Enzyme design. Structure first.
Site, short mmCIF file in Angstrom:
data_model
loop_
_atom_site.label_atom_id
_atom_site.label_comp_id
_atom_site.label_asym_id
_atom_site.label_seq_id
_atom_site.Cartn_x
_atom_site.Cartn_y
_atom_site.Cartn_z
N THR A 142 -3.15 2.33 16.10
CA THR A 142 -3.80 3.32 15.26
C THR A 142 -5.07 3.83 15.91
N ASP A 175 19.10 25.48 11.42
CA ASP A 175 18.88 24.86 10.11
C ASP A 175 18.90 23.34 10.33
N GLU A 216 6.48 1.70 3.24
CA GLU A 216 6.25 2.89 2.43
C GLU A 216 4.87 3.48 2.68
N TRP A 230 2.90 -0.03 -10.48
CA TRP A 230 3.95 0.63 -9.71
C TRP A 230 4.79 -0.36 -8.91
N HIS A 261 0.66 7.22 -12.75
CA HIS A 261 -0.21 7.89 -11.78
C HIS A 261 0.25 7.60 -10.36
N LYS A 267 -4.47 6.55 18.36
CA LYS A 267 -4.32 7.89 17.80
C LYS A 267 -5.68 8.46 17.44
N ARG A 298 -8.46 -5.19 -10.71
CA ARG A 298 -7.54 -4.06 -10.85
C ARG A 298 -6.89 -4.07 -12.21
N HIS A 325 5.28 -2.14 2.19
CA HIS A 325 4.40 -1.86 3.32
C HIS A 325 4.96 -0.74 4.19
N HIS A 359 1.11 -9.65 3.48
CA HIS A 359 -0.31 -9.49 3.17
C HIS A 359 -0.55 -8.90 1.78
N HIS A 360 0.51 -8.56 1.04
CA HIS A 360 0.39 -8.23 -0.38
C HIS A 360 0.54 -9.44 -1.27
N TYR A 388 3.22 3.39 5.47
CA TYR A 388 3.26 4.07 6.77
C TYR A 388 4.10 5.35 6.66
N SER A 424 17.54 10.23 -2.84
CA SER A 424 17.03 11.50 -2.30
C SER A 424 16.45 11.29 -0.90
N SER A 425 15.60 10.26 -0.75
CA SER A 425 14.91 10.10 0.52
C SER A 425 15.83 9.52 1.59
C1 HEA Z 1 -1.54 5.72 3.62
C2 HEA Z 1 -1.40 4.50 3.11
C3 HEA Z 1 -1.92 3.25 3.69
C4 HEA Z 1 -2.20 2.95 5.00
C5 HEA Z 1 -2.01 3.86 6.23
C6 HEA Z 1 -2.65 1.63 4.97
C7 HEA Z 1 -3.09 0.96 6.17
C8 HEA Z 1 -3.49 -0.41 6.26
N1 HEA Z 1 -3.58 -1.23 5.20
FE1 HEA Z 1 -3.18 -0.84 3.27
N2 HEA Z 1 -2.61 -0.43 1.39
C9 HEA Z 1 -2.16 0.73 0.84
C10 HEA Z 1 -2.00 1.98 1.53
C11 HEA Z 1 -2.21 2.06 2.94
N3 HEA Z 1 -2.69 1.08 3.71
C12 HEA Z 1 -1.83 0.59 -0.53
C13 HEA Z 1 -1.30 1.71 -1.41
C14 HEA Z 1 -2.13 -0.68 -0.82
C15 HEA Z 1 -2.04 -1.42 -2.18
C16 HEA Z 1 -0.67 -1.59 -2.80
C17 HEA Z 1 -0.84 -2.16 -4.21
O1 HEA Z 1 -1.17 -3.35 -4.39
O2 HEA Z 1 -0.61 -1.31 -5.11
C18 HEA Z 1 -2.61 -1.28 0.35
C19 HEA Z 1 -2.92 -2.69 0.41
C20 HEA Z 1 -3.25 -3.39 1.62
C21 HEA Z 1 -3.44 -4.80 1.67
C22 HEA Z 1 -3.28 -5.82 0.55
C23 HEA Z 1 -4.65 -6.11 -0.05
C24 HEA Z 1 -4.44 -6.83 -1.42
O3 HEA Z 1 -3.65 -6.38 -2.30
O4 HEA Z 1 -5.07 -7.88 -1.60
C25 HEA Z 1 -3.76 -5.07 2.98
C26 HEA Z 1 -4.02 -6.40 3.54
O5 HEA Z 1 -3.89 -6.66 4.72
C27 HEA Z 1 -3.75 -3.83 3.66
C28 HEA Z 1 -4.13 -3.66 5.04
C29 HEA Z 1 -3.97 -2.40 5.74
C30 HEA Z 1 -4.17 -2.32 7.14
C31 HEA Z 1 -4.63 -3.41 8.08
C32 HEA Z 1 -3.86 -1.04 7.46
C33 HEA Z 1 -3.92 -0.49 8.88
O6 HEA Z 1 -2.65 0.24 9.11
C34 HEA Z 1 -5.13 0.43 9.14
C35 HEA Z 1 -5.30 0.66 10.69
C36 HEA Z 1 -6.42 1.69 10.94
C37 HEA Z 1 -7.62 1.35 11.47
C38 HEA Z 1 -8.01 -0.07 11.80
C39 HEA Z 1 -8.66 2.43 11.66
C40 HEA Z 1 -8.47 3.29 12.94
C41 HEA Z 1 -8.63 2.37 14.15
C42 HEA Z 1 -9.66 2.41 15.04
C43 HEA Z 1 -10.79 3.41 14.95
C44 HEA Z 1 -9.64 1.42 16.18
C45 HEA Z 1 -10.65 0.28 16.19
C46 HEA Z 1 -10.54 -0.56 14.93
C47 HEA Z 1 -10.60 -1.89 14.99
C48 HEA Z 1 -10.79 -2.63 16.28
C49 HEA Z 1 -10.49 -2.74 13.72
N4 HEA Z 1 -3.48 -2.81 2.82
C1 HEA Z 2 -0.87 9.34 -2.93
C2 HEA Z 2 -1.40 8.41 -3.73
C3 HEA Z 2 -2.57 8.51 -4.63
C4 HEA Z 2 -3.49 9.54 -4.80
C5 HEA Z 2 -3.51 10.91 -4.11
C6 HEA Z 2 -4.33 9.05 -5.80
C7 HEA Z 2 -5.42 9.80 -6.33
C8 HEA Z 2 -6.40 9.30 -7.26
N1 HEA Z 2 -6.39 8.08 -7.84
FE1 HEA Z 2 -5.02 6.64 -7.59
N2 HEA Z 2 -3.69 5.13 -7.36
C9 HEA Z 2 -2.60 5.15 -6.56
C10 HEA Z 2 -2.25 6.23 -5.69
C11 HEA Z 2 -2.96 7.47 -5.53
N3 HEA Z 2 -4.06 7.77 -6.22
C12 HEA Z 2 -1.86 3.95 -6.58
C13 HEA Z 2 -0.59 3.63 -5.76
C14 HEA Z 2 -2.52 3.12 -7.44
C15 HEA Z 2 -2.23 1.70 -7.94
C16 HEA Z 2 -1.30 1.72 -9.19
C17 HEA Z 2 -1.13 0.28 -9.75
O1 HEA Z 2 -2.11 -0.45 -9.78
O2 HEA Z 2 0.03 -0.06 -10.12
C18 HEA Z 2 -3.62 3.89 -7.88
C19 HEA Z 2 -4.62 3.35 -8.76
C20 HEA Z 2 -5.81 4.09 -9.11
C21 HEA Z 2 -6.82 3.52 -9.89
C22 HEA Z 2 -6.93 2.09 -10.39
C23 HEA Z 2 -6.30 1.87 -11.76
C24 HEA Z 2 -6.52 0.39 -12.10
O3 HEA Z 2 -6.51 -0.54 -11.23
O4 HEA Z 2 -6.74 0.12 -13.32
C25 HEA Z 2 -7.75 4.55 -10.06
C26 HEA Z 2 -9.02 4.41 -10.79
O5 HEA Z 2 -10.03 5.09 -10.54
C27 HEA Z 2 -7.26 5.67 -9.37
C28 HEA Z 2 -7.93 6.97 -9.40
C29 HEA Z 2 -7.50 8.08 -8.61
C30 HEA Z 2 -8.22 9.28 -8.56
C31 HEA Z 2 -9.51 9.58 -9.34
C32 HEA Z 2 -7.50 10.06 -7.69
C33 HEA Z 2 -7.96 11.44 -7.32
O6 HEA Z 2 -8.51 11.41 -5.95
C34 HEA Z 2 -6.88 12.46 -7.46
C35 HEA Z 2 -7.60 13.81 -7.17
C36 HEA Z 2 -6.60 14.90 -6.95
C37 HEA Z 2 -5.91 15.12 -5.83
C38 HEA Z 2 -6.04 14.25 -4.60
C39 HEA Z 2 -4.99 16.31 -5.86
C40 HEA Z 2 -3.53 15.92 -5.83
C41 HEA Z 2 -2.64 17.16 -5.69
C42 HEA Z 2 -2.13 17.75 -4.58
C43 HEA Z 2 -2.41 17.20 -3.20
C44 HEA Z 2 -1.25 18.99 -4.67
C45 HEA Z 2 -1.73 20.14 -3.79
C46 HEA Z 2 -0.87 21.39 -3.88
C47 HEA Z 2 -0.39 22.11 -2.84
C48 HEA Z 2 -0.62 21.80 -1.39
C49 HEA Z 2 0.43 23.32 -3.13
N4 HEA Z 2 -6.06 5.40 -8.81
O1 LIG Z 3 0.28 -1.46 2.43
O2 LIG Z 3 -1.06 -1.45 3.21
CU LIG Z 4 0.86 -3.47 3.24
#
Ligand code: HEA
Ligand code: HEA
Ligand SMILES: [O-][O-]
Ligand SMILES: [Cu+2]
Ligand SMILES: CCCCCCCCCCCCCCCCCC(=O)OCC(COC(=O)CCCCCCCCCCCCCCCCC)OC(=O)CCCCCCCCCCCCCCCCC
Ligand SMILES: CCCCCCCCCCCCCCCCCC(=O)OCC(COC(=O)CCCCCCCCCCCCCCCCC)OC(=O)CCCCCCCCCCCCCCCCC
Ligand SMILES: CCCCCCCCCCCCCCCCCC(=O)OCC(COC(=O)CCCCCCCCCCCCCCCCC)OC(=O)CCCCCCCCCCCCCCCCC
Ligand SMILES: CCCCC/C=C\C/C=C\C/C=C\C/C=C\CCCC(=O)O[C@H](COC(=O)CCCCCCCCCCCCCCCCC)COP(=O)(O)OCCN
Ligand SMILES: CCCCCC/C=C\CCCCCCCCCC(=O)O[C@H](COC(=O)CCCCCCCCCCCCCCC)COP(=O)(O)OC[C@@H](O)CO
Ligand SMILES: CCCCCC/C=C\CCCCCCCCCC(=O)O[C@H](COC(=O)CCCCCCCCCCCCCCC)COP(=O)(O)OC[C@@H](O)CO
Ligand SMILES: CCCCCCCCCCO[C@@H]1O[C@H](CO)[C@@H](O[C@H]2O[C@H](CO)[C@@H](O)[C@H](O)[C@H]2O)[C@H](O)[C@H]1O
Ligand SMILES: CCCCCCCCCCO[C@@H]1O[C@H](CO)[C@@H](O[C@H]2O[C@H](CO)[C@@H](O)[C@H](O)[C@H]2O)[C@H](O)[C@H]1O
Ligand SMILES: C[C@H](CCC(=O)O)[C@H]1CC[C@H]2[C@@H]3[C@H](O)C[C@@H]4C[C@H](O)CC[C@]4(C)[C@H]3C[C@H](O)[C@]12C
Ligand SMILES: C[C@H](CCC(=O)O)[C@H]1CC[C@H]2[C@@H]3[C@H](O)C[C@@H]4C[C@H](O)CC[C@]4(C)[C@H]3C[C@H](O)[C@]12C
Ligand SMILES: C[C@H](CCC(=O)O)[C@H]1CC[C@H]2[C@@H]3[C@H](O)C[C@@H]4C[C@H](O)CC[C@]4(C)[C@H]3C[C@H](O)[C@]12C
Ligand code: CUA
Ligand SMILES: [Mg+2]
Ligand code: NA
Lengths: 105, 144, 227, 73, 46, 84, 514, 49, 43, 58
Positions: free
Chosen positions: G316, G91, G242, G126, G61, G319, G438, G240, G290-291, G244, G156-157
């Site tokens: 952030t 292009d 990734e 993953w 997934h 923005k 999880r 991490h 932080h992971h 962003y 690819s990327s």
């Molecule tokens: C689009 C993807 C995305 C983005 C953008 C982020 C953004 C951030 N993530 Fe996250 N993160 C994930 C996807 C993402 N993350 C994923 C996939 C994981 C789990 C991976 C795994 O284990 O599988 C994860 C896990 C993860 C962890 C590990 C937790 C754990 O496993 O125990 C942490 C810990 O610090 C973290 C922190 C943050 C922080 C601080 C940001 C910051 O960049 C967010 C900053 C934004 C704001 C703060 C809001 C807007 C700001 C304002 C309105 C200003 C005022 C706000 C303040 C003064 C606070 N993330």
């Molecule tokens: C981009 C990343 C992404 C997205 C979109 C999603 C979408 C969803 N995820 Fe996902 N999820 C992950 C990334 C994502 N997840 C990751 C990284 C993990 C952790 C894996 C791990 O633990 O190893 C995770 C784990 C995770 C868990 C925890 C499993 C566990 O810990 O046991 C669950 C459980 O509810 C969950 C549920 C869902 C659901 C219900 C959606 C739904 O919101 C999905 C609904 C459908 C959509 C959002 C549509 C998607 C399709 C399109 C956008 C195409 C559109 C087409 C055109 C524009 C032409 N996800």
């Molecule tokens: O990776 O937040």
């Molecule tokens: Cu991170």
């Protein structure tokens, strides 16, 4: 930074240019309505007279419309403006959007 | 009503409250009568009848400000259709529960839960706020 | 343990878990405030017919939207780091217990004096005694003295696991070849539950932790009983 | 009844924004006070009250009597 | 040179909306179905 | 490394000012904060008259001959120990 | 001619269309996997099997959603279609290498499929951590096929990154500086730099896992002096950046959509938006541990990573407030794309804030490896990355296709999706705070109510996915051809009509220096 | 002239809300879903040991 | 945006067909697999 | 050696409509067909191997 008075005077001068062309009339109004203000009657007056010199009655009505539109919910601005412009409206024969029924869907 | 496809490279008409005087007139090709009206427009506007002033306006503009700003009933369709599809989803959930899911474990049976609940109170699960805190240990009942 | 419909943290069983509760309250208030301000401002931006579409100068307002978040971050980081260094402080324990993760159960070693060790397996649902908890009970609990500082050492004999007890604020990864230390102190007697917290294969969901906290004299009686 | 006076015509959007950002601040201030009473202090009081006269031996004896323990029947 | 314009800059035809519906149904449907059939495969394998 | 930033096309004053105010001075500000948090005196350790320290093979050419140039009474003991 | 056009392409628009089709198909696969997850958890007990089949599903997934849906759609799809148009370029710099970045992805996906069909699949997460992912706990080909899948997606990327950086630096009009390029172009450039630097480290790490599994190396095996934690460092040094990478092109699209439907010629605070994206990209490389707050790291290191992670909130927030300030004073057009973008601003903000909660290593002890983390990243991914994708798709679909969507249907679709994702993920905060781990196929009984509600939400989002397909069909079925759009003076990609001719800017734009 | 929403919007809204409420209430209450509500104020504790 | 009238308008009846076919194409194969889960866990 | 680049420039700029990968003449077509046949056949073969490896065998 200019006073309100210097801003208004630049815009009066702009629309009062005797040979202002259609492009400059549209550029002027379209630029002015971008600002956070409803244009002063003295500005609108000059823009309406530019419409007269350009033989453009429809744009004169449109200018009254956008003046009302720029006031948003501040319902007292447009009647004050029309009051301040009624001498000019009479002299030039400009009907208001309301007099033309253009204010009803 | 099926217009042109060099249109993308030419100035076009728009009704936009913040662009009150568009780049072109609404009506590009005038009839003889309309051409005569435009000639009258070079004279005093006081001599124009109301009907004629409206026609000058409608040569230049498509919709008035009041017309372009009108509210619609679309939200009713959007909200109602969304609720219909959210309702349809519950049919999927009913189907899933009927044909996919089997029985849940015996620990959810009423007698098990009654015993489990006592055992949790006996071990004072969450005694500060969460759970046992809500039991009256003196009166042997849930705190009212 | 968790209870039905729970919204927040399990009740704190250790002083450090209470500190985390109060720190979470503080941080969640800020999260709620910022979330709600952003939602409010969105609605404010969208609810007026007044317009201003010419270029806006950004410099003055960006001082405010950097300085104010910076101050908020500091106000989060200050108590956050205080609790962090608190957790790390020297505390000299009176007892060391090891746990080794396995696929899929925990073993425990008490080798300060006697060489006591045993395995701790989930009770299958079909064997639960009436009123016991599905997926949470074990056959052999971690008997421990209450109100005392305990050193727990965590490792693994196969894949990664993680040893967790949420109501004590504990989660320490179980890594083969590595001996991770954490400190455990329960303010109360009772039974305290946790679950394996690093994906470890087929029965990751089914190798729980159960602590059994008792008075020292009862802990000594239990230890003496194992000779 | 006579002539209309000149309303404010400049900076209407900026004026609305300022008024409502101030309003939002006041509400935030307000809510922070609610939350401290109803959540943070509530929780501090609940733990302090629970422990102020807590008898851990008595708690254990009650649990022991109910049969909850493996090691202390 | 290639064909240009709406409905011509794509690797699938939109000349007939019902043929198109079949194509899109097969396309998105096959992606959505695949994980269910892989799960069934693993369950049946052993 | 490409670092993590990324903005050329014909380098210039505008880009370097951008770097000065958007990266360099913010980093100085962060490090200034970090340092003001961790300042505050540390306990001066027990004095031990180690022979490889407080070296005196010739009197210093200032003062009473026995004080280093930036002598700090709080943390710099003399060969005989901390001053009163 | 069909094979020449669609298999041998050297055209940025057709290659972008291929990526969009590929990513849509991958989205169906990832949606189906997400429903299988939520079906397993939708009532207490076991539906499918033990944690192996369940976590093969979870692992797939995540890989499909990240590598085959988000990145191909945002970077391969919108990036290839829009970047050359937005800078007036004829292009991409390497039009033929660009086609290879596309065609590496079906083989990558096939390798992921193969991993799940052979043996018992790769039920690793993953993250693919050893030793679970090693050759004793995951004997057989599944994990190796997964590693190879990532290798091909990585190549690819990386090549795509090289293409985008070169194109954006080298192929603007000679008068256009970098500070005259649109924010979406900036967002793709910065994303590409992050990919260039982070993917080779991932490639190193998974290659060491491959050799530990097959050539008797012991990089991660303590018996040889290796360390499982080293793998985690290498993985997260990529992982991490990734996340962003997953959100930055989304930020760029949101900037354009909010600007457009506010009736503005430009986003508020352009240079601040560039600064903020560059700052986020830079800070995204120094926070990875932080992971790893529960693996046993020293306290000072936990303190540094707590602090450095929180500072990303500052750029952030610039923005977020700049988008709000772009709305400010606008003539708001309540289009479906605008609705996606407004949902983005709010829900991305919630998810970012729970990220800041997790940055605090003391609280992360209790929140790590629980559903609180799952709630955090599905708010920024399911309600951030995906909302930006849907907003850009509805906004630019008439440019790419030449046909209009039905706006009412698109608004209905937004409404269904908004309910579905929030019902799915908001209760997962409670599950996390209360300690549900999880990667579990079943949970203690107390966790039932919120798992039941979350699974119900996942079906509502399924209904939205199905409706989208119908909406795209209806547009191609009815064939309403675009005539004009507003604001072309500040949206160059529209000025060659809809769709633009196969070759655009054969005569480049004229831009002078005053 | 009246559009689709003028002609049908009232009916779509009323029928949509009615169907949605009815089917979710049925799903929630009539098919054996176990919501597992809190036992607080609900369950009579029963001897287990 | 402005657009020409639809070249091949899709009536409400045609939309009901397209919608129904679309939904069925997602639901029926998954439904068939999930319906037979017990039949799979026993072979 | 002598510089024969001008004669290759004449060859590869000949207005014969051929894409660059075929403009060298018949040898290009052979090498292309060898490459593509090995790629497509090898890919079919990889699919057969998946099918074999997807079920308990050996
Ligand atoms: C689009 C993807 C995305 C983005 C953008 C982020 C953004 C951030 N993530 Fe996250 N993160 C994930 C996807 C993402 N993350 C994923 C996939 C994981 C789990 C991976 C795994 O284990 O599988 C994860 C896990 C993860 C962890 C590990 C937790 C754990 O496993 O125990 C942490 C810990 O610090 C973290 C922190 C943050 C922080 C601080 C940001 C910051 O960049 C967010 C900053 C934004 C704001 C703060 C809001 C807007 C700001 C304002 C309105 C200003 C005022 C706000 C303040 C003064 C606070 N993330
Ligand atoms: C981009 C990343 C992404 C997205 C979109 C999603 C979408 C969803 N995820 Fe996902 N999820 C992950 C990334 C994502 N997840 C990751 C990284 C993990 C952790 C894996 C791990 O633990 O190893 C995770 C784990 C995770 C868990 C925890 C499993 C566990 O810990 O046991 C669950 C459980 O509810 C969950 C549920 C869902 C659901 C219900 C959606 C739904 O919101 C999905 C609904 C459908 C959509 C959002 C549509 C998607 C399709 C399109 C956008 C195409 C559109 C087409 C055109 C524009 C032409 N996800
Ligand atoms: O990776 O937040
Ligand atoms: Cu991170
Ligand atoms: C006030 C704005 C706040 C936005 C902040 C939210 C931020 C995040 C998400 C930001 C999301 C944007 C919110 C959209 C508000 C629309 C106005 C049009 O009008 C015009 O001519 C142009 C000028 C517009 C000026 C506004 C006047 C409004 C007039 C019409 C009234 C609309 C009533 C809508 C009523 C909507 C009620 C939901 C008309 C079509 C409206 C469609 C509404 C869909 C909303 C879905 C959200 C989930 C609901 C689930 C329903 C099904 C649930 C079942 C369980
Ligand atoms: C520019 C405008 C558009 C921009 C927006 C894009 C639109 C977005 C929504 C899109 C809305 C339209 C959807 C169109 C359906 C396409 C037909 C070609 O199609 C045609 O020639 C159709 C018209 C002429 C008919 C020829 C006969 C075909 C008969 C049967 C074909 C069945 C097709 C389905 C077969 C199913 C395909 C797989 C060449 C294209 C390659 C794209 C990659 C596909 C995904 C492959 C995934 C890898 C698999 C690995 C296993 C992975 C295993 C999983 C683990
Ligand atoms: C669009 C609808 C789709 C349907 C799906 C749902 C959507 C979510 C909407 C839901 C509307 C959300 C409004 C605030 C929810 C707080 C619930 C709560 O009581 O939380 C309690 C705490 C822990 O608290 C405790 O330890 C003690 C709790 C008990 C207090 C004493 C009273 C005893 C009875 C309790 C009664 C309940 C009190 C609630 C009182 C209620 C106060 C508001 O849990 C937590 O931390 C969970 C926090 C998650 C982190 C994100 C927070 C920022 C979100 C702000 C905007 C929401 C976006 C929603 C996402 C988008 C929403 C539009
Ligand atoms: C304050 C911020 C730094 C700014 C620079 C400060 C001084 C720089 C002067 C020149 C530095 C060159 C080397 C000189 C040698 C020693 C100076 C070292 C720097 C210094 O200033 O060291 C100080 C000692 O200065 C001492 O002895 C004596 C200091 C004065 C004596 C100078 C002696 C003459 C040196 C001649 C060198 C000839 C070089 C020729 C090179 C040509 C090739 C340290 O003070 P402290 O009390 O011991 O400890 C601190 C305890 N709280
Ligand atoms: C575990 C086993 C994994 C196996 C994975 C194998 C993956 C792929 C098989 C690769 C087959 C490669 C075939 C040759 C590719 C040559 C590309 C090239 O050379 O691209 C050039 C551009 O890249 C440039 O320069 C930049 C320099 C050239 C880049 C060449 C890179 C080749 C790919 C190698 C993998 C790199 C991974 C790096 C990080 C670890 C030219 O670009 P074109 O668009 O073509 O033309 C533009 C015209 O104007 C030229 O006249
Ligand atoms: C028991 C009942 C169960 C029902 C379940 C479904 C519930 C909800 C359905 C709600 C659907 C709303 C769909 C959007 C309708 C408004 C579309 C619209 O308003 O867009 C305009 C529609 O135009 C027009 O005639 C009007 C065209 C209206 C088309 C309406 C089509 C409805 C199809 C419904 C299919 C349901 C299938 C259910 C399963 C069997 C077109 O815009 P322009 O091209 O700019 O203008 C062109 C003009 O010449 C048009 O005259
Ligand atoms: C998580 C995403 C999944 C979403 C849920 C899908 C919603 C339901 C879709 C309907 O699917 C059909 O359901 C039938 C039952 O209603 C099944 O017929 C089955 O049951 C019938 C009645 O018992 C028999 O007549 C048939 O032979 C037997 O195949 C049939 O196979 C299946 O395609
Ligand atoms: C255009 C290009 C298309 C290429 C198509 C090539 C097809 C060749 C397939 O031949 C197979 O090769 C297997 C190996 O791959 C052999 O196994 C053999 O090979 C191995 C030793 O190398 C061992 O498994 C055993 O000794 C032995 O059974 C097996 O007999 C045979 O069916
Ligand atoms: C100098 C540079 C570019 C200015 C230009 O040439 O247009 C601008 C663009 C974004 C600005 C930054 C952002 O506005 C964010 C911060 C705002 C604070 O008010 C000052 C520091 C702050 C970090 C700014 C420093 C500087 O003014 C920056 C970096
Ligand atoms: C339902 C089916 C397409 C199914 C599919 O796409 O999978 C199509 C194929 C041919 C179609 C028919 C005709 O070709 C066209 C007719 C168009 C009318 O507006 C609706 C009914 C109408 C009589 C169609 C009914 C239906 O849409 C048919 C029968
Ligand atoms: C995490 C990494 C070690 C990875 C390894 O085990 O392979 C180490 C190597 C260098 C370390 C950094 C350097 O020691 C410098 C800093 C020292 C501070 O006490 C903590 C932060 C600090 C920034 C360290 C954080 C972290 O422990 C780093 C980055
Ligand atoms: Cu052991 Cu998970
Ligand atoms: Mg972990
Ligand atoms: Na389950």
């Amino acid at each position: 930074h200019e006073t309100d008075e210097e801003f208004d005077a630049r815009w009066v001068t702009y629309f009062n240019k005797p040979d202002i062309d259609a492009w400059e009339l549209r550029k002027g109004m379209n630029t002015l309505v971008g600002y956070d203000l409803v244009p002063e009657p003295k500005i609108i007056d000059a823009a309406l007279r530019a419409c007269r010199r350009l033989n453009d009655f429809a744009s004169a009505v449109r200018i009254l419309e956008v003046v009302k539109d720029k006031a948003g919910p501040h319902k007292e601005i447009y009647p004050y403006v029309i009051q301040e412009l009624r001498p000019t409206l009479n002299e030039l024969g400009i009907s208001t959007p309301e007099e033309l029924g253009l204010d009803k869907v | 009503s099926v217009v042109k496809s060099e249109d993308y490279a030419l100035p076009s008409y728009v009704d936009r409250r913040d662009y009150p005087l568009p780049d072109v007139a609404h009506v590009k090709n005038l009839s003889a009568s309309q051409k005569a009206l435009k000639e009258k427009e070079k004279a005093s506007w006081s001599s124009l009848s109301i009907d004629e002033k409206v026609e000058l306006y409608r040569l230049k503009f498509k919709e008035s400000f009041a017309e372009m700003n009108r509210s619609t009933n679309e939200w009713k369709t959007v909200v109602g259709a969304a609720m219909f599809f959210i309702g349809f989803t519950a049919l999927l959930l009913i189907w899933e529960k009927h044909y996919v899911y089997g029985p849940i474990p015996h620990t959810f049976e009423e007698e098990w839960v009654a015993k489990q609940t006592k055992r949790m109170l006996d071990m004072k699960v969450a005694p500060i706020q969460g759970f046992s805190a809500k039991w009256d240990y003196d009166k042997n009942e849930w705190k009212k | 343990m968790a209870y039905p419909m729970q919204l927040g943290f399990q009740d704190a069983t250790s002083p450090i878990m209470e500190e985390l509760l109060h720190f979470h309250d503080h941080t969640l208030m800020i999260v709620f405030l910022i979330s709600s301000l952003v939602l409010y401002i969105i609605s404010l931006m969208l609810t007026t017919k007044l317009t201003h579409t010419s270029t806006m100068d950004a410099q003055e307002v960006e001082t405010i939207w950097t300085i104010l978040p910076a101050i908020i971050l500091i106000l989060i980081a200050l108590p956050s780091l205080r609790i962090l260094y608190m957790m790390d402080e020297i505390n000299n324990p009176s007892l060391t217990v090891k746990t080794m993760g396995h696929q899929w159960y925990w073993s425990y070693e008490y080798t300060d004096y006697e060489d006591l060790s045993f395995d701790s397996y989930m009770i299958p649902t079909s064997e639960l005694k009436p009123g016991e908890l599905r997926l949470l009970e074990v056959d052999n609990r971690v008997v421990l003295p209450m109100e005392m500082t305990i050193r727990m050492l965590v490792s693994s004999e196969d894949v990664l696991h993680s040893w967790a007890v949420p109501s004590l604020g504990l989660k320490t990864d179980a890594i083969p070849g590595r001996l991770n230390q954490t400190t455990l102190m329960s303010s109360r007697p009772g039974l305290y539950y946790g679950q394996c917290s690093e994906i470890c294969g087929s029965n990751h969901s089914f190798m729980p932790i159960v602590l059994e906290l008792v008075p020292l004299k009862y802990f000594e009686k239990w230890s003496a009983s194992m000779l | 009844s006579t002539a209309l006076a000149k309303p404010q015509m400049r900076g209407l959007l900026a004026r609305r924004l300022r008024f409502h950002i101030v309003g939002a601040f006041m509400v935030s201030l307000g809510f922070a006070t609610f939350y401290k009473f109803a959540v943070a202090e509530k929780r501090k009081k609940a733990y302090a009250d629970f422990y102020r006269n807590y008898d851990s031996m008595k708690d254990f004896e009650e649990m022991r009597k109910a049969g909850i323990f493996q090691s202390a029947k | 040179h290639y064909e240009e314009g709406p409905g011509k800059n794509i690797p699938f035809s939109v000349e007939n909306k019902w043929r198109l519906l079949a194509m899109m149904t097969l396309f998105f449907g096959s992606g959505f179905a695949a994980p269910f059939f892989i799960v069934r495969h693993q369950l049946l394998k052993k | 490394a490409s670092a993590a930033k990324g903005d050329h096309g014909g380098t210039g004053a505008r880009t370097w000012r951008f770097l000065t105010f958007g990266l360099a001075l913010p980093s100085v500000a962060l490090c200034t904060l970090n340092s003001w948090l961790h300042s505050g005196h540390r306990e001066r350790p027990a004095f031990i008259p180690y022979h490889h320290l407080r070296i005196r093979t010739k009197p210093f050419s200032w003062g009473d001959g026995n004080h280093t140039f930036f002598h700090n009474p709080r943390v710099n003991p003399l060969p005989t120990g901390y001053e009163k | 001619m069909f094979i020449n056009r669609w298999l041998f392409s050297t055209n940025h628009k057709d290659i972008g269309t291929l990526y969009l089709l590929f990513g849509a198909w991958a989205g169906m696969v990832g949606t189906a996997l997400s429903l299988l997850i939520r079906a397993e958890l939708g009532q207490p007990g076991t539906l499918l099997g033990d944690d192996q089949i369940y976590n093969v599903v979870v692992t797939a997934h995540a890989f499909v959603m990240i590598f085959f849906m988000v990145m191909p759609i945002m970077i391969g799809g919108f990036g290839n279609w829009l970047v050359p148009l937005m800078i007036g370029a004829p292009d991409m710099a390497f039009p033929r290498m660009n086609n290879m970045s596309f065609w590496l992805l079906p083989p990558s996906f096939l390798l992921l499929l193969a991993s799940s069909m052979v043996e018992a699949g790769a039920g690793t997460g993953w993250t693919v951590y050893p030793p679970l992912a090693g050759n004793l706990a995951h004997a057989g080909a599944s994990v190796d096929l997964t590693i190879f899948s990532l290798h091909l997606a990585g190549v690819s990327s990386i090549l795509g990154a090289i293409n985008f950086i070169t194109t954006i630096i080298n192929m603007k009009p000679p008068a256009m500086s970098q500070y005259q390029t649109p924010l979406f172009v900036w967002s793709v450039m910065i994303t590409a730099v992050l990919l260039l630097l982070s993917l080779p480290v991932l490639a190193a790490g998974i290659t060491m896992l491959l050799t530990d599994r097959n050539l008797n190396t012991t990089f991660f095996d303590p018996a040889g002096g290796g360390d499982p934690i080293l793998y985690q460092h290498l993985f997260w040094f990529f992982g991490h950046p990734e996340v962003y990478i997953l959100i930055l092109p989304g930020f760029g699209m949101i900037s354009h959509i909010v600007t457009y439907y506010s009736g503005k010629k430009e986003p508020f605070g352009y240079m601040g938006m560039v600064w903020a994206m560059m700052s986020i990209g830079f800070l995204g490389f120094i926070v990875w541990a932080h992971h790893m707050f529960t693996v046993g790291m020293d306290v000072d290191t936990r303190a540094y990573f707590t602090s450095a992670t929180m500072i990303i909130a500052i750029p952030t927030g610039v923005k977020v407030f700049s988008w709000l300030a772009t709305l400010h004073g606008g003539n708001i057009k309540w289009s479906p794309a605008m609705m996606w973008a407004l949902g983005f601003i709010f829900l991305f903000t919630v998810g970012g804030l729970t990220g800041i909660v997790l940055a605090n290593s003391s609280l992360d002890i209790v929140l790590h490896d629980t559903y609180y983390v799952v709630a955090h990243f599905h708010y920024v991914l399911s309600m951030g990355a995906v909302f930006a994708i849907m907003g850009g798709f509805v906004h630019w679909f008439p440019l790419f296709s030449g046909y209009t969507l039905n706006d009412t249907w698109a608004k209905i679709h937004f409404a269904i999706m908004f309910v579905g994702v929030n019902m799915t993920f908001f209760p997962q905060h409670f599950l996390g705070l209360s300690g549900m781990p999880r990667r579990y196929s079943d949970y203690p009984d107390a966790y039932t109510m919120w798992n039941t509600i979350s699974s119900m939400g996942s079906f509502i989002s399924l209904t939205a996915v199905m409706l989208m397909v119908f909406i795209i069909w209806e547009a191609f079925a009815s064939k309403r051809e675009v005539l004009t759009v507003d604001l072309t003076t500040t949206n160059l990609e529209w000025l060659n009509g809809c769709p633009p001719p196969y070759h655009t800017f054969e005569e480049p734009t004229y831009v002078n220096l005053k | 002239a009246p559009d689709f929403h003028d002609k049908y919007g009232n009916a779509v809204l009323a029928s949509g809300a009615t169907f949605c409420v009815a089917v979710w209430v049925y799903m929630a209450t009539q098919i054996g879903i176990e919501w597992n509500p809190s036992p607080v104020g609900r369950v009579t504790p029963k001897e287990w040991r | 945006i402005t657009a020409k009238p639809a070249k091949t308008p899709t009536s409400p009846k045609e939309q009901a067909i397209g919608l129904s076919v679309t939904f069925l194409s997602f639901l029926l194969p998954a439904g068939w697999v999930l319906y037979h889960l017990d039949n799979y866990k026993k072979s | 050696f002598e510089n024969r680049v001008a004669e290759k420039q004449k060859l590869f700029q000949e207005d014969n409509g051929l894409p660059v990968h075929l403009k060298g003449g018949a040898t290009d077509n052979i090498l292309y067909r060898v490459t593509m046949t090995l790629c497509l056949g090898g890919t079919l073969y990889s699919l057969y191997c998946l099918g074999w490896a997807s079920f308990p065998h050996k």
